[PDB]
Design a protein around this ligand. Structure first.
Ligand SMILES: [Ca+2]
Ligand SMILES: [Ca+2]
Lengths: 68, 69
Protein backbone atom coordinates (compact mmCIF):
# COMPACT_ATOMS: atom_id res chain seq x y z
CA UNK A 1 0.00 0.00 0.00
CA UNK A 2 0.85 3.70 -0.34
CA UNK A 3 2.04 5.52 2.76
CA UNK A 4 -0.48 7.30 4.95
CA UNK A 5 -0.08 10.87 6.21
CA UNK A 6 0.26 10.72 10.02
CA UNK A 7 -0.02 13.86 12.17
CA UNK A 8 0.24 14.59 15.88
CA UNK A 9 -1.99 17.63 16.21
CA UNK A 10 -1.49 19.82 19.25
CA UNK A 11 -4.43 22.05 18.43
CA UNK A 12 -6.88 22.52 15.62
CA UNK A 13 -9.74 24.87 14.94
CA UNK A 14 -11.72 26.51 12.18
CA UNK A 15 -10.75 30.13 11.57
CA UNK A 16 -11.76 32.70 8.98
CA UNK A 17 -9.48 33.87 6.18
CA UNK A 18 -9.28 37.24 7.96
CA UNK A 19 -8.18 35.62 11.23
CA UNK A 20 -5.59 33.62 9.31
CA UNK A 21 -4.09 36.87 8.00
CA UNK A 22 -4.17 38.40 11.51
CA UNK A 23 -2.30 35.41 12.91
CA UNK A 24 0.55 36.02 10.49
CA UNK A 25 1.29 39.34 12.19
CA UNK A 26 2.16 37.60 15.45
CA UNK A 27 5.51 36.25 16.61
CA UNK A 28 4.31 34.23 19.63
CA UNK A 29 0.98 32.39 19.43
CA UNK A 30 -0.86 31.28 22.54
CA UNK A 31 -2.60 27.91 22.44
CA UNK A 32 -5.67 27.34 24.56
CA UNK A 33 -5.18 26.02 28.07
CA UNK A 34 -4.99 22.23 28.23
CA UNK A 35 -4.27 21.87 24.49
CA UNK A 36 -1.49 19.55 25.70
CA UNK A 37 -4.16 17.29 27.25
CA UNK A 38 -5.83 16.70 23.89
CA UNK A 39 -3.12 15.87 21.38
CA UNK A 40 -4.95 14.31 18.46
CA UNK A 41 -3.41 11.53 16.44
CA UNK A 42 -4.68 11.69 12.88
CA UNK A 43 -3.95 9.89 9.64
CA UNK A 44 -5.35 10.66 6.20
CA UNK A 45 -7.90 12.92 7.86
CA UNK A 46 -9.16 10.23 10.22
CA UNK A 47 -8.98 10.71 13.98
CA UNK A 48 -7.06 7.73 15.41
CA UNK A 49 -6.86 8.67 19.05
CA UNK A 50 -5.97 11.28 21.58
CA UNK A 51 -3.40 11.72 24.22
CA UNK A 52 -1.32 13.98 26.34
CA UNK A 53 2.14 15.52 26.04
CA UNK A 54 4.77 14.03 28.31
CA UNK A 55 8.34 15.11 28.85
CA UNK A 56 10.38 11.91 28.67
CA UNK A 57 14.07 11.49 29.47
CA UNK A 58 15.34 12.47 26.01
CA UNK A 59 12.31 13.49 23.94
CA UNK A 60 8.68 14.52 24.14
CA UNK A 61 6.18 11.73 24.11
CA UNK A 62 2.48 11.30 23.67
CA UNK A 63 0.68 9.32 26.35
CA UNK A 64 -2.32 7.69 24.66
CA UNK A 65 -5.57 8.13 26.52
CA UNK A 66 -7.69 6.49 23.85
CA UNK A 67 -7.14 4.67 20.58
CA UNK A 68 -10.44 4.91 18.71
CA UNK B 1 -17.53 27.56 2.82
CA UNK B 2 -14.64 29.50 1.27
CA UNK B 3 -14.07 31.76 4.29
CA UNK B 4 -13.45 28.74 6.51
CA UNK B 5 -9.94 27.51 7.11
CA UNK B 6 -8.92 24.33 8.92
CA UNK B 7 -6.00 25.51 11.04
CA UNK B 8 -3.68 22.97 12.65
CA UNK B 9 -0.66 23.20 14.91
CA UNK B 10 1.21 20.01 14.15
CA UNK B 11 3.87 18.73 16.51
CA UNK B 12 5.03 15.98 14.18
CA UNK B 13 4.01 14.57 10.84
CA UNK B 14 5.32 11.76 8.73
CA UNK B 15 4.42 9.49 5.85
CA UNK B 16 4.18 6.05 7.42
CA UNK B 17 3.28 2.57 6.25
CA UNK B 18 0.17 0.74 7.39
CA UNK B 19 2.42 -1.73 9.24
CA UNK B 20 4.16 1.12 11.06
CA UNK B 21 0.80 2.60 12.03
CA UNK B 22 -0.37 -0.82 13.27
CA UNK B 23 2.72 -1.08 15.46
CA UNK B 24 2.07 2.39 16.85
CA UNK B 25 -1.47 1.36 17.75
CA UNK B 26 -0.05 -1.29 20.10
CA UNK B 27 1.67 1.36 22.22
CA UNK B 28 0.47 3.40 25.17
CA UNK B 29 3.32 5.93 25.13
CA UNK B 30 4.71 7.14 21.82
CA UNK B 31 8.12 8.78 21.64
CA UNK B 32 8.45 11.71 19.26
CA UNK B 33 11.72 12.42 17.49
CA UNK B 34 14.29 14.55 19.26
CA UNK B 35 13.42 18.23 18.77
CA UNK B 36 10.08 17.66 17.05
CA UNK B 37 9.21 20.57 19.37
CA UNK B 38 11.58 22.82 17.38
CA UNK B 39 9.43 22.37 14.28
CA UNK B 40 5.81 22.89 15.19
CA UNK B 41 4.13 23.33 11.84
CA UNK B 42 1.21 25.64 11.21
CA UNK B 43 -1.11 24.18 8.56
CA UNK B 44 -4.02 25.84 6.80
CA UNK B 45 -6.27 23.46 4.84
CA UNK B 46 -3.43 20.97 4.79
CA UNK B 47 -0.86 23.44 3.46
CA UNK B 48 2.22 24.53 5.41
CA UNK B 49 2.07 28.22 6.41
CA UNK B 50 4.90 28.51 8.86
CA UNK B 51 6.75 26.87 11.67
CA UNK B 52 7.89 27.56 15.15
CA UNK B 53 8.96 26.23 18.49
CA UNK B 54 6.88 25.03 21.39
CA UNK B 55 7.20 27.29 24.46
CA UNK B 56 5.77 27.01 27.95
CA UNK B 57 4.16 30.37 28.66
CA UNK B 58 2.71 31.48 32.00
CA UNK B 59 -0.77 30.00 31.61
CA UNK B 60 -0.61 27.99 28.38
CA UNK B 61 1.68 26.53 25.77
CA UNK B 62 2.67 28.80 22.95
CA UNK B 63 4.31 28.63 19.56
CA UNK B 64 7.26 30.94 18.97
CA UNK B 65 7.24 31.62 15.23
CA UNK B 66 10.55 31.09 13.45
CA UNK B 67 9.28 31.39 9.88
CA UNK B 68 6.12 32.49 8.13
CA UNK B 69 6.14 31.25 4.54
CA1 LIG C 1 -1.89 13.36 32.84
CA1 LIG D 1 0.47 16.44 32.06
Amino acid sequence: PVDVKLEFVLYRKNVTLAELEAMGQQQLLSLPTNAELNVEIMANGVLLGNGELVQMNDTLGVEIHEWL
